[PDB]
Design a protein around this ligand. Sequence first.
Ligand SMILES: [Zn+2]
Length: 606
Amino acid sequence: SSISLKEIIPPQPSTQRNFTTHLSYDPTTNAIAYPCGKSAFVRCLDDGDSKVPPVVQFTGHGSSVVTTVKFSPIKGSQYLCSGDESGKVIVWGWTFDKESNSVEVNVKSEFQVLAGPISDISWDFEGRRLCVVGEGRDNFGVFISWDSGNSLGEVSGHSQRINACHLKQSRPMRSMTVGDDGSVVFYQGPPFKFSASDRTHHKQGSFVRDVEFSPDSGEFVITVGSDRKISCFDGKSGEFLKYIEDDQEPVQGGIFALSWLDSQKFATVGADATIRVWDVTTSKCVQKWTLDKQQLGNQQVGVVATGNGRIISLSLDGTLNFYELGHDEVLKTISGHNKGITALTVNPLISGSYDGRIMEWSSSSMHQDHSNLIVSLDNSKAQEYSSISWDDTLKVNGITKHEFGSQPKVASANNDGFTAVLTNDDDLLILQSFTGDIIKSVRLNSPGSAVSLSQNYVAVGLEEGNTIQVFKLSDLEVSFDLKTPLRAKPSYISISPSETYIAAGDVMGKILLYDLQSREVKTSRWAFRTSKINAISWKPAEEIEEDLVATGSLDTNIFIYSVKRPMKIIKALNAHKDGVNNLLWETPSTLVSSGADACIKRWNVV
Ligand SMILES: [Zn+2]
């Protein structure tokens, strides 16, 4: 008996309005790396099976939000380096096993380099030296050896935050840091030391957001930022050569990032929802790609060349845009969440995160209709969905059909188009999932922290005495208490599909199973988790007697308990960094999970 990882749907890159998201591409593994939440990710652009794992997730930054992920230049080195807001940098390496289909990640070195958050990282072409940069009190960046951490130079010339850096990928080594107040500094080195400074080519007070030396011998260095200027320096002397401008292509917005396709062409991307391709020599824009400027989400917050003219653009809305030099049309788009997932539906698969974004995977549709946490999702009605959010509304296919007078704490929908909601004002409401109408309601005697709506019952977890009261859907005036309360505040309740039992767990990790009818505990034998329970889902039949029950807790684990054999536990550890939020059975043998880490995972239950 087991559970094995069947598929991983990774989140989109982390984003912030007015801020660049530095991406990284690795030719060898044909994959890109990017930060999202508290984990670093590497996603293989390779569809057709390959020896490269689809996804690699590094959780080593613990509680610190990851800011940047960079591939080591050494082909096949499978090493990467990432930084976080706490100012810590980590060099880690992964491992894969196409067989077990298991990915291992082992840290190799960690360094507390900055007081504040790290903004960018860059390796030397030997994959042994690092330019780390960002913000601090006295230090705005450092130059250190990847294994020891001993200083290999000194970041200087900046008084304000450093935004990006880059190491000329060839000898004689040279470096570049760039940041706030139009500051651009050049270094020389192996022992990188201040060489030259510049505060005349980028407007004072502006933000220079990215810098990058041309591939091969790096004959040039280019910096970009909010003043819409593209400055071109010489890769050796660092002398300003010229601005890259084309009369037929005025830059109408601040630039966020750049990436060289080869030694002559490089891409830029910015607030004017445009992806432009330039030729350093002619200073002419050779190719342009646009998106509707009228939509905030189209601003281009990142970019990275992936070889042979292929370019990947990052939208403020987290979308990944694939383009190719010579082809005026966008090749394909990839959307998804970049915020913890809080609501889940199956057959068809739909997900919602705590920012209110909803994802329809059956049509690759991404919605930004709600503007806050998605409490629940209901797809019972054919080709439609009903969503409830902390933005106090109930929407049906992105359209508002109900405005709550009181915020919806938690909710639960059955299969007959009904949704039971518990509000901040301590009310239990029963809505018609698809019209938004409240057909019946009742004031609860105490705040409620959990709901489970079956075909005929409504089980509510009550904070006062952490008891479970069961309501009759058809008549809220009738109800009964289960003989035994919980240990601590109820966190999640799941009524049996046949309404025989009721599984309810608490914020401490206890999960009691009751017999609904007799309202008596049927077993408290299921193993204590020592962590908040966030999800419980009954496995359906392929016997027919309800037995296996999947559950998830803040501790990141998935525990599939058994009614018949309370001592037997099938488990999957580290399912989702920082906790499992949702759990569903889309197939009698397949589980689907969502986590605080904005990941969605499918599992094969053997
Ligand atoms: Zn929509």
